[PDB]
Design a protein around this ligand. Structure first.
Ligand SMILES: [Cl-]
Ligand SMILES: [Zn+2]
Ligand SMILES: [Zn+2]
Ligand SMILES: [Zn+2]
Ligand SMILES: [Zn+2]
Ligand SMILES: [Zn+2]
Ligand SMILES: [Zn+2]
Ligand SMILES: [Zn+2]
Length: 369
């Protein structure tokens, strides 16, 4: 059988920063941008859909610190991130975004308002700690490795550095940890990532942190999982139909794993499905803030502009909501925070499914129902 991961609490990795193996910047850093003639005076569709304006009558994230494990953040008054460490550049501190990504994630979670545009984060009063775990601008320094061994792949190394980043994030004192990383591998080629499970457990059970994970996006090593087989009723979530493990997504319910929807409310076609997905949130045609706290809604692609999109943004909305919840109800354990998010979500046609889990989050219901 395909088995859910079994957590070994004794396997917590050392609290140390830096990459699993040496890394070097090979490309100049990207910056986010805008579609010609965009008007940011209006509220982004995701803000209207999630009723952020209303939700803020009830909570703003004041007193809460969210750690963001992503590509780093270029800080500004509107995205006032603090150093959380670097797991890409051995000399870094998490306050350099070379990918036009982590800055935007952080802005969705906790971006401040401005009178000149309609954008605001979910938890605009929250603190933000930035941990850089990934960058497309860096490459591993040439190394002699065994190419037939899953434990010496870049994915395996990336999961080893992730496990330490989760330990470190927890040690920083964050009460919500947003994990944008969604590492993929084939179920028949298992990586030993016992440390990731132990780190997630430590964050959630030892340091009182809510952990939110991106469902992941298809492409490359992330090939879509098949749906559950209805003829096998003892496996309603279809664990036995899985081909692609997504980590740490698959540690659910230790983590709440978040899939993507678009502006019409449908599951995003790039959103990685699986038995571990618990909820969903907006993940397409996203508006966020850039390196100066300026509104952005486009990125440089291969043949020109592409939209801001991905399950990392879905996870960012949910991390924001968790922050709102923990402010308004500080007595809630991380299990109760998560359960509140899922229990008030708008459930899909089958009640729960592998694309959206319990469904699309509903901030006002979560805060008041
Ligand atoms: Cl990441
Ligand atoms: Zn088996
Ligand atoms: Zn067994
Ligand atoms: Zn150290
Ligand atoms: Zn990463
Ligand atoms: Zn540390
Ligand atoms: Zn992303
Ligand atoms: Zn628990």
């Amino acid at each position: 059988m395909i088995e859910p991961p079994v957590i070994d609490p004794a396997a917590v990795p050392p609290d140390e920063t830096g990459p699993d193996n040496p890394m070097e910047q090979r490309r100049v850093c990207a910056a986010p941008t805008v579609y010609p003639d965009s008007n940011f005076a209006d509220r982004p569709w995701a803000s209207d859909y999630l009723r952020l304006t209303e939700a803020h009558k009830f909570a703003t994230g004041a007193g809460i610190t969210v750690a963001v494990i992503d590509t780093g953040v270029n800080g500004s008054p509107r995205v006032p991130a603090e150093p959380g460490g670097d797991f890409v550049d051995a000399a870094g501190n998490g306050m350099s975004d070379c990918d036009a990504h982590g800055t935007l994630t952080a802005s969705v979670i906790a971006g401040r308002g401005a009178p000149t545009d309609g954008f605001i984060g979910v938890a605009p009063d929250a603190r933000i700690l930035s941990l850089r775990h990934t960058s497309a601008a860096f490459q591993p320094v040439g190394a002699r490795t065994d190419p037939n061994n899953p434990n010496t792949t870049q994915t395996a190394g990336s999961l080893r550095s992730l496990a330490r980043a989760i330990v470190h994030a927890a040690n920083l004192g964050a009460q919500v940890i947003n994990i944008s990383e969604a590492a993929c591998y084939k179920v028949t080629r298992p990586i030993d990532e016992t440390g990731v499970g132990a780190a997630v457990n430590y964050a959630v059970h030892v340091k009182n942190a809510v952990v939110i994970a991106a469902a992941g996006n298809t492409g490359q090593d992330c090939t879509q999982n098949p749906p559950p087989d209805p003829a096998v009723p003892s496996d309603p979530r279809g664990w036995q139909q899985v081909q692609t493990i997504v980590s740490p997504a698959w540690y659910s319910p230790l983590v709440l794993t978040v899939g993507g929807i678009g502006p019409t409310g449908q599951p995003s076609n790039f959103s990685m499905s699986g038995p571990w997905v618990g909820a969903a949130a907006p993940a397409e045609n996203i508006t966020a803030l850039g390196y100066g706290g300026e509104p952005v809604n486009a990125l440089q692609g291969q043949d020109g502009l592409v939209p801001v999109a991905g399950t990392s943004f879905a996870a960012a909305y949910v991390s924001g909501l968790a922050a709102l919840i923990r402010q308004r109800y500080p007595d809630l354990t991380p299990a109760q925070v998560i359960n509140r998010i899922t229990a008030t979500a708008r459930h899909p046609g089958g009640g729960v499914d592998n694309y959206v889990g319990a469904g699309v989050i509903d901030p006002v219901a979560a805060l008041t129902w």
